[PDB]
A paper describes a structure:
The most abundant flagellar building block is the flagellin protein that assembles in a helical pattern of more than 20,000 copies to form the extracellular filament. Successful assembly of the flagellar filament relies on the FliS protein that prevents cytoplasmic aggregation of flagellin10 and guides flagellin to the cytoplasmic side of the fT3SS. At the fT3SS, the flagellin/FliS complex interacts with the cytoplasmic domain of the fT3SS transmembrane protein FlhA (FlhA-C). Therefore, FliS acts as targeting factor directing its flagellin client to the export gate of the fT3SS for subsequent secretion.
Multi-angle light scattering analysis indicated that the B. subtilis flagellin/FliS complex forms a heterodimer. Crystals of the flagellin/FliS complex were obtained in two spacegroups, the primitive monoclinic space group P21 at 1.5 Å resolution and the primitive orthorhombic spacegroup P22121 at 2.1 Å resolution. Notably, residues 46 to 57 are kinked by 45° in the orthorhombic structure, while the helix is straight in the crystal structure derived from monoclinic crystals. Apart from this difference, both structure superimpose well with a r.m.s.d of 1.5 over 329 Cα-atoms. The crystal structure suggests that the flagellin/FliS complex forms a rather compact particle detectable also in solution by small angle X-ray scattering (SAXS). The two proteins interact by an extensive network of hydrophobic and electrostatic interactions with an interface area of 2600 Å2 which can be divided into contact areas 1, 2 and 3. Contact area 1 involves the C-terminus of flagellin (D0-C) wrapped around the surface of FliS in an extended horseshoe like conformation with a mainly hydrophobic interaction area of 1600 Å (Contact area 1). Contact area 2 aligns FliS to the D1 core domain of flagellin, a region that was not present in previous crystal structures. Interactions within this interface are of more electrostatic nature (Contact area 2). Taken together, our crystal structure shows that the interaction between flagellin and FliS involves a complex interface at flagellin including the D1 and D0C domains.
Residue numbers in the entry:
A (entry chain D): 46 to 102, 106 to 304
B (entry chain E): 13 to 122
Write the structure that this text describes.
Amino acid sequence: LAISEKMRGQIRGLEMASKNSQDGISLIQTAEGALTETHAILQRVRELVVQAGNTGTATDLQSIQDEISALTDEIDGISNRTEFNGKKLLDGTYKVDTATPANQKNLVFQIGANATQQISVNIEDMGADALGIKEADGSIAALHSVNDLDVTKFADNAADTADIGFDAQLKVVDEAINQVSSQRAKLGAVQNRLEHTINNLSASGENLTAAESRIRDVDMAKEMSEFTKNNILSQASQAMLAQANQQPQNVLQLLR
Amino acid sequence: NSVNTATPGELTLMLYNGCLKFIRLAAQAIENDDMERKNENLIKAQNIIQELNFTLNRNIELSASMGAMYDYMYRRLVQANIKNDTGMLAEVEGYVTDFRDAWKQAIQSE
């Protein structure tokens, strides 16, 4: 057992780096899955804005606006409830803050070969009042956010009316869609970097366990699984000696 | 529960069964798009495979091929995690089922 016990100490560093990279990838996949929902909701909001801009039936406008307001509330819910290990990911907790860096919070990941190079990652506010036409700075002026959409104003304003006409409110949705797409793409690049780290960690572990890194592909693993299964059946006493070496308190902990 | 009761062979069988349970839970989490749940269960499954590998008596000849399978199972579960690949999970589930079924027979006929 002592041979196997020190093999733990050899690759303990690689295993914990592998767990950290897995945790980081799943955090990003959690954020990306929620952003996919927000993007889909924004696409539906655009359909309703376009429908409102072509409707001459104002109670139709009010019913369309009711749906839009419920959809932008869905966007707020996603930005407020999306979490990984209790950390709010999409509510602006981790947004960049170049105007006041003292207020900025970063997500930290470990990247590169050996998973020792730290990087900082930010995620912008994805709530409805933080998506839309941005000013020169990060700010969104009045009537320029997805939360400000109001298609009932189309009844009293021409399509080219500033801020509240059909063209301007449609532009708010287009900009918001691209903002969500940009945030998801930036997180995908980080995920790609963590994937490369995982594959270098695996190659490092493959080198340190030569003759236990022996299984290459599905064909070998399938064939070795059947061969090993039959050897366990045929050599029960050897199988017991080889593997039945767990201590009871470690088993209860692993089965939680 | 009543673990100090179990024989050494029965303890190992408990580990194989837990590994399968956590892989199945992670596959289900992938269908439900629950990334955190998938990640939690695959790491649980990986920890079991690593505990099995590190409790091998490598003076016994059988330990070489069992540990080589554990190494592939661990690497394959990591890939399935980051790729959301249920197909990969079904592959590793088949290996653990092989080990589980043979182990359960081994402690019986003994």
